[PDB]
């Protein structure tokens, strides 16, 4: 039963590391997009506050 619990823990760790390894899948893409798609003057208008 403890081995089954440890297997479930390893599955949860893999699920968490899927997002942890998705740090490079999102951060670099967002940086490149902000360098290219955002370009300059992409500050919108903070009229609400």
């Amino acid at each position: 039963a403890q081995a089954e619990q440890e297997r479930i823990r390893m599955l949860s760790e893999a699920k968490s590391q899927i997002a942890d390894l998705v740090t490079l899948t999102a951060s670099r893409v967002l940086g490149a997009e902000l360098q290219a798609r955002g370009h300059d003057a992409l500050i919108a208008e903070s009229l609400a506050a």
Binding site: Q2, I8, R9, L11, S12, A48, A49
Partner: protein, 504 residues
């Protein structure tokens, strides 16, 4: 990604001085007196370290840090999130070891939950509560017979550094297997290896099917140890108010064990002294009694209007050289509805549970006992009181008379009856059967240095020859006149048969 244009004007301040887990936050106006300050991630740090804005001085906010303060530097920005400290509550906390912030630390995965309860709240009230009636069967015959604990009772376990306080608490937690009660074990300031050993003990006996562990180890910050018992108390409040499914029934009864409120008070004293608050006795802050009481008045027994649930508190206090007259021991003794005194002198003298029945008190009393236990425990308590009285003439005064010698010897047999091995709880039917055997002169022939063995073998007898007697006793343990002729027979008969077949 779910952002609602992000227009929130969060109040911010700057860290002007960070010391020993305490940070001065400079201008952080409109902050509530116990908010969570965020410390947003910065260069070289990808996580947010939360703090508790305790000291709201003029033009200064002193906040204790719930984590490592080494990464917090002077000039760092802090945002005053409007939320107070809250922890996840519900069914998903069962079987999980979490830190006082609710984050799982056993590595088994994220906590599944839908409700967050604040760790700080007012006690259930005045008209909310009800008289304590349902017993908490600890499985220890001494406690369950002489210092009973009921559902909704604050029972202190006070003792020396190594006397069995954690053992008593763990045995009590283990005994609530099919009793329909959710146990919570808050580890405050304990070493992480000890908490791991406790969790392993609970897993060995299958107690983690219904147990939540909220541990703040010694290496963690004093802020985490300070909110360590209030978290977990929130979980017990949610269990006692909303209920939780367990073995197919909606359990609304909780048993919370603060394994060190002495260490909790030490952590709060460290917090207060680092905040430069005025000291009191033994350098403790003035509001250290207000602290524990605020924690311990939340353990209630609600009436049927408010759900009928209950939260049972088992504070644990470690005294130095059996000095129960210190500040924190006196505070917790005054707050609680009963005390369990454990002595190292009794522990070394063979009395393994180490119950000091003479000074241990249960203010609920017979209301926290089954009617069978009430019937079979009054004579036991009276005889033990007589033995404690005239035990002075027992070491070297040997002549005495027939009456004094008989009372001394009966007290010795009853005291030997109360000795229990660890991790071997006794069911209430077994306890009342053994106490009926002892209190009705059925043990007057078997000598003293066999009594415990006798008890064990008797229970084995009742577990093999006559299980129906145990079932009969357990079925009618609640009637006012417990020793009915149906139950008095087949129990006296069982005792006589066992005494005949077994030479003792």
């Amino acid at each position: 990604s779910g952002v609602d244009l992000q227009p929130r004007q969060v109040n911010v301040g700057t860290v002007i001085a960070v010391g020993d887990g305490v940070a001065r936050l400079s201008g952080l106006d409109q902050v509530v007196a116990s908010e969570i300050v965020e410390f947003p991630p910065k260069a070289g740090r990808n996580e947010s370290i939360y703090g508790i804005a305790l000291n709201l001085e003029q033009d200064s906010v002193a906040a204790i840090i719930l984590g490592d303060d080494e990464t917090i530097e002077e000039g760092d920005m802090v945002t005053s999130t409007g939320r107070v400290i809250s922890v996840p509550v519900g069914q998903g906390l069962l079987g999980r070891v979490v830190n006082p912030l609710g984050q799982p630390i056993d590595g088994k995965g994220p906590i599944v939950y839908e409700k967050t309860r604040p760790i700080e709240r007012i006690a259930p009230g005045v008209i909310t509560r009800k008289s304590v009636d349902t017993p908490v069967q600890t499985g220890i015959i001494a406690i369950d017979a002489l210092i009973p604990i009921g559902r909704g009772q604050r029972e202190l376990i006070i003792g020396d550094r190594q006397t069995g306080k954690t053992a008593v608490a763990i045995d009590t937690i283990l005994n609530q297997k099919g009793q329909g009660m959710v146990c919570i074990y808050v580890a405050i300031g304990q070493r992480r290896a000890q908490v791991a050993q406790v969790v392993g003990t609970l897993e060995r006996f299958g107690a983690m099917e219904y147990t939540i562990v909220v541990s703040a180890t010694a290496s963690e910050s004093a802020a985490l140890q300070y909110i360590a018992p209030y978290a977990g108390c929130a979980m017990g409040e949610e269990i006692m108010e909303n209920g939780v499914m367990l073995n197919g029934q909606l359990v609304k009864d909780a048993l919370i064990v603060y394994d060190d409120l002495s260490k909790h008070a030490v952590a709060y004293r460290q917090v207060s002294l680092l905040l430069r608050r005025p000291p009191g006795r033994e350098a403790y802050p003035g509001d250290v009694f207000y602290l524990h009481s605020r924690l311990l008045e939340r353990a209630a027994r609600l009436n049927e209007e408010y759900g009928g649930g209950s939260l049972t508190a088992l504070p644990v206090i470690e005294t130095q050289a059996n000095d129960v007259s210190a500040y924190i021991p006196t505070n917790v003794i005054s707050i609680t509805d009963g005390q369990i005194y454990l002595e190292s002198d009794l522990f070394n003298a063979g009395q393994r549970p180490a119950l000091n029945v003479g000074i241990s008190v249960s203010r609920v009393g017979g209301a926290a006992q089954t009617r069978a236990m009430r019937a079979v425990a009054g004579k036991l308590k009276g005889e033990l009181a007589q033995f404690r009285d005239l035990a002075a003439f027992a070491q070297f005064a040997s002549d005495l008379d027939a009456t004094t010698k008989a009372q001394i010897e009966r007290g010795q047999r009853l005291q030997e009856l109360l000795k229990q091995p660890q991790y071997q709880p006794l069911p209430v039917e077994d306890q009342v059967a053994v106490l009926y055997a002892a209190t009705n002169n059925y043990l007057d022939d078997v000598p003293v240095p066999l009594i415990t063995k006798w008890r064990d073998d008797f229970l084995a007898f009742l577990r093999t020859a006559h299980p129906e007697v145990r079932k009969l006793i357990y079925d009618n343990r609640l009637d006012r006149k417990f020793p009915t002729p149906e139950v008095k027979e087949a129990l006296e008969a069982a005792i006589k048969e066992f005494k005949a077949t077994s030479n003792y």
